[PDB]
Structure formats: structure tokens, C-alpha cells
Amino acid sequence: MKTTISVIKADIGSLAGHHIVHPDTMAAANKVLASAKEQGIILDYYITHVGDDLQLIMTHTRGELDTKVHETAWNAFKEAAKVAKDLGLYAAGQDLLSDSFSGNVRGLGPGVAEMEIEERASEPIAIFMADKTEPGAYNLPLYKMFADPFNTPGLVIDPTMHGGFKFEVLDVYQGEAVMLSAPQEIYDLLALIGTPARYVIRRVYRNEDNLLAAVVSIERLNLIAGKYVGKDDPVMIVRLQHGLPALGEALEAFAFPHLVPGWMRGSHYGPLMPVSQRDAKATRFDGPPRLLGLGFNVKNGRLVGPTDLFDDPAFDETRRLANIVADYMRRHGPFMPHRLEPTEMEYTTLPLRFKK
Amino acid sequence: MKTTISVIKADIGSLAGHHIVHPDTMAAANKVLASAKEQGIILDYYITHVGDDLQLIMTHTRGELDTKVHETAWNAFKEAAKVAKDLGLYAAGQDLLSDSFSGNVRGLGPGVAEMEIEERASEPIAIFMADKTEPGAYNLPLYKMFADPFNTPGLVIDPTMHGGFKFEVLDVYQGEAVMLSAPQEIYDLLALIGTPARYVIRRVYRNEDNLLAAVVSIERLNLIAGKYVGKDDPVMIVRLQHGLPALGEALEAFAFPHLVPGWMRGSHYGPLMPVSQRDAKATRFDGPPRLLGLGFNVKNGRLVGPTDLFDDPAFDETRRLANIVADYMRRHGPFMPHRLEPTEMEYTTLPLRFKK
Amino acid sequence: MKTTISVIKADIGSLAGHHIVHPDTMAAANKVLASAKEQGIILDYYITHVGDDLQLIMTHTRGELDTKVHETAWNAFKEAAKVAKDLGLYAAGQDLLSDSFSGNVRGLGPGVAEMEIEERASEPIAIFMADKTEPGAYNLPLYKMFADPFNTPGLVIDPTMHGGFKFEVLDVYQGEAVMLSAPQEIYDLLALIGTPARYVIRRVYRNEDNLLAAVVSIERLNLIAGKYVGKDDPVMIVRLQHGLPALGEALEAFAFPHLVPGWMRGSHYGPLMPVSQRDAKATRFDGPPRLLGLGFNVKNGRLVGPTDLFDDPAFDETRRLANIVADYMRRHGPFMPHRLEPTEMEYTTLPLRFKK
Amino acid sequence: MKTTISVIKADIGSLAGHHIVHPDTMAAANKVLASAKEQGIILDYYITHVGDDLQLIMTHTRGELDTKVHETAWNAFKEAAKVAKDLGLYAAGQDLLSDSFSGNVRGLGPGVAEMEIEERASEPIAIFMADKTEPGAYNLPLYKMFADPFNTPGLVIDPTMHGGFKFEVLDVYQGEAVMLSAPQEIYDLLALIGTPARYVIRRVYRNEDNLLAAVVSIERLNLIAGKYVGKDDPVMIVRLQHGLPALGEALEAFAFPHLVPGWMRGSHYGPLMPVSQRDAKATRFDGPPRLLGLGFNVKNGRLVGPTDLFDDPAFDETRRLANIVADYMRRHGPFMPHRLEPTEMEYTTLPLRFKK
């Protein structure tokens, strides 16, 4: 008997630009999930947003890629999008690329990260949700959490973690994945994941017992649509403690606001800014990219929490540095490396008299 | 069938100096607009303030310079001023220069920015309202939003924007306007708008289709009254997205807190400080100048929102820099260039034994 | 009768790594140029280095791409490389890719920027030489100097400059060039030069009279060798004053230390640090990239000067920001966008178990 | 036929406290080494100091632990100490613990780092010499240089380095050493070297070919004398380039001024401050600890150089941070963790009424 934690998210429109989810659209999604919970389809849920991305966090006993859970999410998004359209919100139904649902949401526009697990003696988790970036934004943090002993001293001091972790790395262009184990294969790992537009960490497992420790949403709108229609805006679930990274080691991996692709027009690098729920909205230059972190405990399918992780003074300098770096990046205007590299600009309209 | 967005504002008195609009005066204005909405004169409205300037944001179907909409605003201001006088507020009825109303508010004291438009597939807008400065304070930001590719990379990457924008520049001293198109005429444009006391951007249009993209209030109290009676305190409406600047590009143009004329006694340059609604009040040296930004979507004449745009951590360094610059400017005392140039001081009382 | 200014440079080996040119190698080059000057091949010269790149600045009356001037430079490099080898310097003869010389140095390894001009009533110039980067590093500065009215207010105020400048942009991958004129074609210009690895500004001309105003070295070692053998380390000559940018406008364009490609192992972005002659050496992470600027007047083929342009307190904050940004970039380790994009890594050894 | 690089150092007394080597004592050492060079005992040498430690850098063909080379160093120290005593310098002959020499300097007081090598196609090296700390101060930097891919991206991108490096770790308390290979054994490595007073990296080798890449002096005065008589003040030689860390990767490892044990009275942690030769002297609180870095090329036993590595603006923020951290540490007074842990204080006089 297992519990599945599913985070399914989508942009269904937003106020004043790609800025923030309107509360009336969340209330519409809530009605759908409330009904699903009453019917016993799901055991519990929490709805929120980061920027213009509406987040459905659900626990249930129906496994990964469950048609009914995914269809419940789809319906919640559709009801939210209808309210968005009635309110004349910008980009109403943005990420709902298909007219209809079948099978599951993957390839329809919504992003999904989910894990079916056996709840541990206690089951603390952190869920990270980002706006204005793509799934590869989690590569550097996951490398740090699970492989870098300067981030996660448990790797050095905690006998249960000494055996290390392995990474399922997806080549999103070719649709093939490889497993690489730390610390033995870290140089090979970094040779790949250092290119986050192509090679994305999708899951992480503990080596000793193959315990599933983290999952990342790997939907990429560029690759689904064949052109730029928005930033993917990814989510990740990380299990904590008991020989997995401590909450503090997971958070340590976000204390440095690294440059991630996306931001204005899906065409720029900007610093990932960890923020409180109230600050999870896109402003200057349609960002900077925003990261919301929520901590929960899962108990018999119940979601206890959330606690808003980055809403705390220990991240005030991280936010200040993100602001300073955003200004520095912006002084580059439309030049690389503030503007994206050509292989990723090729999905924008940029492509649209030379003499020998 | 078109929707008109009208922002009409006026100083009708304030608490403790030129500091803040008193809530009882807003409640008085509200009664008038509530009645107008009930009667179907206007479709929706939002009332707020920036500093000592009371803001009436109205949507309706009666066009630009409509006598009845303007008279509704005038009456709301008069009721607010009566409450101000009953409360013994400072400068009760300040900007109500005429004893009576006729035609429209222009030349009577209140400022107005309005645009009659066809609502787009969605109609996101930003409305900017400033205290302690004059309309030319928007020249540099509008130049950046609509012409500078280091601000608005859509000009470079977005095929719909590549054709550029044109600017209606008003010579406010001579009462004549010229149209200049970017990027071809940017050097000529800057030769004018670099003198913001004289040449003010009044409207901006997209070149390809002549779509009206922005409007600025161009009432100038100095020029209406023939002497200094206050700072004009201007407003601007900017349409967003769909081949116009993104919300983030409009906000990028205010990320640098530039020096603007006004501040204490209408006689100084100080940095434009973008602020939240709660911080939209004038304090040190009767400023620094304050900028409030509200995002809305317009839907069949309904105002959805507002979202308070600058109330966000991405502008915390902008505010800090404004504070540092304010202190630096203030160490100049009554010397140029902190004090205004003679041609603009001539409207103050400054003019009021030399030997060959 | 014209004067040609030729800057020909090459890495012929360095002390302790890719750090600094050894003085004995400069003395060897000097002997060759001293002889050439005595023979009347060249009229004057100045020898220096930036980092590990030995710089030959020569004036003569023999035109661009002169075989004898280029062969003189080649011989000076060969004598310098022989001393480097005798001293056991690192990478002795690094940029001397050919065993022998023919025609000119282009394609043999050395970089060259040269302009044949008619000396003006006075002929002030600035010569910029960079280590640990590539020619496209000058794209943003040249755009600013010659097209951006926020950099070069002469474009707005100086009637002789109002007509603007045009840019010869080389597609270095395809070996074709296009001319684009500012301000009319700036959005098209930026769409190209924003990708500096591919599209490089090679020359700039004044529109009114087609006066040649600047030239950049466009040798790219990657493209010459078919693999990474070093950073190109480019040079540029800019003519000043008399309706061309003032010295101060040229220097303004380097006051922002932008991110440029190169740095460690030719595989990273780092900030361009303008430095004095004494600080023109590569240290932390084999950089940051260094920029030396020398001002001269040219008088009947005589080089009057140099003055060391960035050795001045007005660039102390530029250097401090470069240091702060270098640290921030370095915390990214081997991840983009600190590490280069894949299309440019493909020249490194990086290219050297996936399941569906 | 091999070349040996030997760095042998000792404190023979200093001016005004433990502050700086007096030049007359260096001139005395010079006479001895000049004679040794004339006799052909050594091929070349360079004499300098860091703080109160007199440094003899010698190249020769006599191998590691050569009695005659060590006796030459001993004699140079004795002549320098005689001058120190004649000048009434503080702590004249400090590190000369034995009255007489036999075999080699190890265990007599002087520190030694030496490597017998086959000179590579070119042989660039960096020599690091520190005052006011102990050999374990190099553990974190050597880990970074040779194992951390966020420091040395060659580990990821350079096929010649992908196989990694191994570390000879000396347990200085038990006098036994272990070899640990990166990246496979990094967690075990860090579990040891994270305690730098006990486990010290002594040598580093490349895994592929067992090439000797670095050596550290492991003399520890506490353990030689059985009590505190000074800080060991260690030296290290690092070979560079050609599939070993680049100069810039070696320097990157010192860009963070980490806390190291020693400083005042051998009893405190303070930040390691990389400095120029002119700044290599101990001041505030008898520090902070100082690090001098000299780059050379070795050519047929000749020392070409030095270049003063940290005398460069790229380390100005490193020095500023060291100053800020020194002040912060100092506000702790005699409390851990500014004061050393008890197991290391036990060598001081600290050890020299409790009721149940």
C-alpha cells in the first residue's frame, strides 16, 4: 500500500501580463479538487500558485500517471481557465494546449512531478515550484543536494548516506535517459547536466537501497509545441531526512541564486530568486525567476503543512544578491550571455544582404 | 463599440502638509462615483491616492474628453474638497482652480490621461500615478519602454514589434505637437524630450497599425496658473502585451530611479521612487517623488485588479538607491542642479546693488 | 598619401601558465622592429603585452594587408618565440600555427587590426587589446560607442554626428558580411551582434562621408584550427574626436564590465576587466578577461604616447564590480551560463548508456 | 635525468616581533647559496620571505632528502641566524631546534617541500608559502584544485584529467599515510582532511599515470618539540598545465580566504590572506595568516621568474573579505571557535577548586 504525491501545474491565465494567478481561478480549481476529495479519488490536496502558474498538490493512492488523477487536474485547470476567460485575464488557458484530455496531462501542456512511495517512519518532504524558468533550473540544486559534500555534509558524516546517490538524467532532445552514480561518476554527470536545456535530472535515488528521493517535472513546452509558447515553469518533490538530505541541506542548495534560463520572453538568463508565497509573482522584466518552497509531512495520505520555506530572514541576502545580479545582467540588453544561446532562441521568433 | 479608460486626478487637500490624502475625502469621492456607476454613466471605477493626489480610475463608453465623465470627476473632487475643508486639511481644494466646471477638467486644475480603445483579445494595462513631479518625468521611462532595445528586447526579437513605435511630443510652452518615429528618428526625439519641462511625450503609437499604446496627462499647473501652485503630479496609462511592451518591459523602465523635477516647493530634482500603495506618501523633503503602479485587465468595461506593481522585492534596491541619491542630492542645499534651473524657478517666488 | 596603423599580435608563450609575456621575449621582438624602423619599412612602433599576448603597434605607409609589414611582425614573433622556447616558457610559439609565413599573418595564428587613413587635422586614437576573450567581446562596446545615444551624446547634440554610423558585421561562420546603418537598422543590428560568437562587428564607418572610424581583429583560432587552441584575444583601433566619438565616449563604452566568452580553458563567461598596463596579466581562473587601452596621437606616421587609459580612479568601481561578478559567476561551477553554450564548447574536448 | 625542486624554509628571527625577515639575514643566506651554486651543488635558487619565514627555493639534480642540499640550507639558515643575533632580532634562530645538522633538515626545525621530477615539454609551477599557520591549511585548497569540479573544470572538460587525482594523506599523529582516489573516495577523503591538524595532504598524483603533481611540507613543530614553539608555516609546490590544474585553477583554490589555525600565539583561527611580496608580513594580531604565491617555469634546472601571483587586482576582494572576517573573528576574544580546540591548545601553556 503506497501513497502517491502528485504535483500537477499549469498556467491558465494571469492578471496584467504573466504576473500572478487571480484568486477567482484558484477558487474554481478548488471546487473540482474538493469534489474529487469528497469522492475519495484523492485523499488530500493543497492549491497555490507561483507567479502565473496554478499549482495542484495532491495525495492519493492511485499511482503515478493515473488517468483519473490527471483528468481531475485537467478539469480543475479547465474550470480555472473558464473563470480566467470570463475575467478577461491575459493568456487565458495558456498551458492548455489540447482541446481535450486523454490518458494523462503529459504532452497536453501541464507539468507534472509525482512519486509513488511507501511512507517512511515519518515522511517530511519539500515541494519546489518555479516561475519563469525551465526544468533544468533544478540541475545545479539537485547536484548540490545529493552529490556535493560542501552542500550536504551527511554524505561525509552520516553512515547511511556515504554510499551516495544516483541520477536519472533525461536527454530531452533525444528522449533517452541514463543513470549516473555519485561520487564515482560526478565528472560525467556534470559534463551533461551543465547543459540544462538538454540534459535534465528527472529523478534521484539512493544507491544503497534504490530509494526514490526526488522527482522533477520534465515537460518542456518548446519541445511539445515546436515553438516558444511560454516558460515550462517546473516543479520538484524532494523527500527529506532519514538518510536523505535534511530540510536544511535541501534549502542550502538554493541559498545561491544561480542564473537560469527563461525570464522575459523566454529569452534570457536571470537569477533564481527564492521567495515567500506573498512574493511569488513576476514583476521587473517579467521576473526575476521566482522559487516557492513548501514543506509538508505526509501522514496516511494527509498533507500536514505547508510551511513557507523561503519566507525567512536566512534568505534575505539571497534575495538581495538576486536583485543586484538582475540589474547587472540587464545592463547587457539583448546580448549573450544575458540573452539565450542561439540553439534555444531558435524556438522564439528571432529566426524570422550578406555578401561574400 | 469602444471602451474608454479615464484616469482623472486632483489634489483636494491633505493631512499635515502635502503628505497624504485623508480617507474621509476618498469616501466622499466614492459616493459620487458609486452613483455615476449606478446610473450607467461609467461602467466601473477604482479610487486611490498617490501622496496628496486623489485618483479616479474610470471605465466607460463615452469617449475621450466627455463632458459628463469629466463633470462626474469634478463633482467627486468637489465633495472630497468639502470634506477636506470640514476637516481643516492643508490646502483644501488645492487643484480646483476654477470655481465652476465647464466642458471638461482640462485647464481647471485636475490632470487627465484617457484613451478610447477597442479591447484586444485580452486587455492588460498598467496605470502609473506620481506625486511631487511633472508629466515630463515619464519621458525617459516611455523612451525606454517603446524605443530602447536594452529595455524592451521585444523590439529585437518579436516580429510584431520590429517596426517600432512613434511618439507624439508636445511642446507645452508653444502648444504644438510633432510625431517622431523610432528607431529612425531617435536622435531627434532625444534632442527634444531630454528637456522634459518643455517637450513631453503625450501619446505613443505602434508604427505598423497606428495602435494607441500609451497616454500621459499633460496638464501643467505652472502654465495653467502663470505661477507655481503645486506640482502637476502626472498619470499615464500603458497598454501591454500582444506586440506592445510586456508588463515586465514597462516595469523595467522604472527600475532606474531617475532624477525628476518637483519635490520640495516644486523647486528641486530628486529620484523617482517606485512604491507600494502603503508607501505612496510624501515625507523627507516632501518626497522623494513617489510612483504608484497598478496593473489591471479591462474586460467589457470592467476593471479586473488592481495588482500593486512596485510592492515587490524586485524593486527593493531601486528604493534603496533612491534613498541614497536623495541624501546625496540634499547635500547640495539650494544649489543647481539639485535646485531647478532658472527658467523653471521663474514660476516660483524666487524672482521676487549691482555695480558695473 | 596615407598613414596605416597596424596592430598585429600573437601569443608566443608565457610565464607560469597563460599568465604574462616575459620581458626577454618583448626585447627580441623589439630588435626586429627596431631594424624595420631603421630600414624605413615602418615609421614608428610601440611594443607591449596584455596577459600572454605580445602586441606590435606599428605605423607605416604600406597599406592594409602589406606582405612586408606582416612578415616583419611574423619575424618578430618568431624571434620572441625562440627566446620563449630557450626560457622553457609555457606554450612557446602558441599562436604561430604555421611553420612558415606567406602573404600575410591572417590564417597563420596572429591577430591583426589595421586601418589605412588620411590623418585628420589631428589624429587621436585609442587602441584596445584584450586577453582571455574573442573578437565579439567588442560588439557591445562598439554598439554603445557608435549607436547608443545614452553612451555617446554627440549623436544627439553634435550636428556632425547626427547622421549616425554604419557597421560592417561579419558572419564568421559563413564568411560573409553585411552593412547595417544606425539608427534606422539598430533592431536588425542587435538581432545579429547579440550573438558575438557568430556575428562580429569588423569595421565602423560614419554615414555622412563613409569615414572609416574603427577596425576589429576578426581572426578566430577555433575557426582557423578546427578546434580550441586558445582564446583569440582581440584588438581594436578607434579613431576619436572631430565628429567621431570623444575619447570619453569610447571609454564610457567600457565602464560596464560585461560578460564575455573565454576565460578558463576558453570555456566560460566572465566580466571584461579594464586594467592598467601593470595589471594586464591573467590570474584567478586564468583571468578575469583583461582589457588594456592605450591612447595615442598619430602625427606624420609618428606615434605620440601612449597614455594608459584605464589606469585611473574613474575605473576603480568598474574593476570592483568585475571582481564581484567574477566570484558570482564562479559559484556556478561547470554549469551554463558560466560555462559556454554547446555550439561553442564543441571546439573543446568536451565532446570526447542512454536508454529509450 | 631528473630535476629536483626543493623549497626549504625556516624562521631564523625577525624584526619587532614575529613580523618580518630582516634583509641583512637574507643577504647572509644568499652568500651561502651563491657559493653552492658556484660549486655546482645546486643549479639555481631564489631567496625570499613570507612574514618571519626565510624561504630557500632551489633547483638541483641531487634528488629528494639530499644530505648536501639540506646541509647547504642548514648552513644558510645558520649564517642568517648569526646575523639575526648580531642585530638583536626577536627569536634569533627560532626554528633551528638542533645545535647541529645530520642527515637532512626534517626534525631539526626547518620545513621542506621537494619533488624530483622529469621536466615536461614545459614545466610551469606555483610555489605557495604561508606564515602564521600549519600544513593542514593547504588541505581545502588542494582538495579544490585536484578534486572539485566547481574549482577545476578541467576535471569535467579535459579528457586528460577525467581520470582524476589521488591524495597521499598523512596521519601526522600516528605517522602513517593512506592513498585515496578522487572522485570515487571523496567522501572518505573529506572525513579525514576536514580535520587538518591531524590529517594532512602530503602529495597529490594523477591517477592515469601516477604523475607527481603537488607536495606539501609536513613538518609540525608542535609534534617535533612536544610543545608550542611557533607556527609550522608551510610551503607547497604545485605543477601546472598539461593535464594538471591550470595556473588559474590553482589560484581559484585560494580565492576564498578560509579559516586556518595559527595566528596569534599559535592559538587561533583566522582567514588565510593571499598577498603580494611587499604585503607578506604579519601585523594585526600577528597576522592575519599570509600566503605568498610565486609562479616559475623550470628549464634545465633554471628558475625562470618569479611572477608574484596574488599581487593583482583579482584578489583585492579576497583580501577585503579576509579583513572583514578577521575583525568578526576577533570579537570572539578567547572563545572557541576563534581560539583553538582543546586538543591543539594542549601544546600551549593553557594547560598550566572544583567540587562534586
Ligand SMILES: [Mg+2]
Ligand atoms: Mg503566463
Ligand SMILES: [Mg+2]
Ligand atoms: Mg509561469
Ligand SMILES: [Mg+2]
Ligand atoms: Mg509557463
Ligand SMILES: [Mg+2]
Ligand atoms: Mg498638495
Ligand SMILES: [Mg+2]
Ligand atoms: Mg501631489
Ligand SMILES: [Mg+2]
Ligand atoms: Mg500637485
Ligand SMILES: [Mg+2]
Ligand atoms: Mg597563452
Ligand SMILES: [Mg+2]
Ligand atoms: Mg591570451
Ligand SMILES: [Mg+2]
Ligand atoms: Mg590567445
Ligand SMILES: [Mg+2]
Ligand atoms: Mg617567528
Ligand SMILES: [Mg+2]
Ligand atoms: Mg612564521
Ligand SMILES: [Mg+2]
Ligand atoms: Mg613559524
